[PDB]
């Protein structure tokens, strides 16, 4: 009957959730538990480049607080 | 373990994909093709067996020669049969295509498509019932189920 279409869609629907959920989680794994910063203007790139050189480890996803 | 055993399973794998995706060709000549439509009709759906009709011979595995094959058409049928990429199968359908059928003694009928293309399965009748052709298609599927093409390759 018509509900026999669900197997075609059920594991198809899973296959269209992986590309979305995976990217969000992969970003958080690589970027130290924070979202992937997005540079759409030169102002933001200067800020990431700043954080890349602020931190001793040359990575912009480690954030130094008020401890300097 | 023996290397022969792995070969057969691959042989059964390639055969299986060729059994459940048997695409015929929209090549109904006459008066059996009406019952070749009924095979495609709701009652005896061919999409159940992964059997889908495609117009181009380049994308057709089996050719259902359904209907009387005449002299004027004989050169065309062989040409179309040649275009189908191998492996290809032919399923002669009905009396007019198996032998000459009702027009065996006419001056412009080739007495059976077996004279022009090599036939794999013959489906008798006039017209064969939609089940009779479906039994032919299934009996063609069981033919691919026993090919032994990769098994002999190990023996060559």
């Amino acid at each position: 009957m018509w509900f026999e279409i669900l197997p075609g869609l059920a594991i198809m629907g899973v296959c269209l959730v992986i590309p979305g959920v995976s990217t969000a989680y992969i970003h958080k794994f690589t970027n130290g538990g924070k979202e992937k910063r997005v540079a759409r203007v030169q102002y933001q790139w200067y800020l990431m480049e700043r954080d890349r050189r602020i931190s001793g480890v040359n990575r912009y996803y480690v954030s130094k607080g008020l401890e300097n | 373990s023996r290397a022969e055993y792995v070969v057969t399973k691959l042989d059964d794998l390639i055969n299986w994909a060729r059994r459940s995706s048997l695409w015929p060709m929209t090549f109904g000549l006459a008066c059996c093709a009406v019952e070749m439509m009924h095979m495609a009709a709701p009652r005896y759906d061919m999409d159940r067996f992964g059997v889908v009709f495609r117009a181009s011979p380049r994308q057709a595995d089996v050719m259902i020669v359904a209907g009387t094959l005449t002299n004027k058409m004989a050169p065309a049928l062989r040409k179309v049969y040649d275009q189908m990429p191998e492996p290809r199968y032919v399923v002669s359908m009905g009396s007019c295509a198996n032998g000459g059928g009702y027009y065996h003694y006419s001056y412009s009928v080739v007495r059976g498509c077996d004279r022009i293309v090599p036939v794999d399965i013959y489906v008798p009748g006039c017209p064969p019932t939609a089940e009779a052709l479906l039994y032919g298609i299934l009996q063609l599927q069981r033919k691919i189920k026993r090919e032994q093409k990769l098994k002999i390759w190990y023996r060559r």
Partner: protein, 115 residues
Amino acid sequence: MNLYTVIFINILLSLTLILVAFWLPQMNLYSEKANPYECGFDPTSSARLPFSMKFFLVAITFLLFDLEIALLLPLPWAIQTIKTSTMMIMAFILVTILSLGLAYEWTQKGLEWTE
């Protein structure tokens, strides 16, 4: 470099599949098979002969309408301009000008196909 990897990953994937398409299966070639298809019968003439179209007038005006959008896609950044009034007039005129050209093409049977 992230975007270079993706297309070259796709290119490799597409090449590998098509490469496996041509060397995996068993082939048996002869002249009758590789000839043009043309619905069972041998073609009377090649398919390279001049094949006249009849929508060439719409084909040309498609270019002018394609350049026409190139003058409209800057609108989202043009709205940010301090003026907001010169932009709007020069936006209506461009769209209105396209319409009048389309309207004249309409009445002259430009969009209709040569019989």
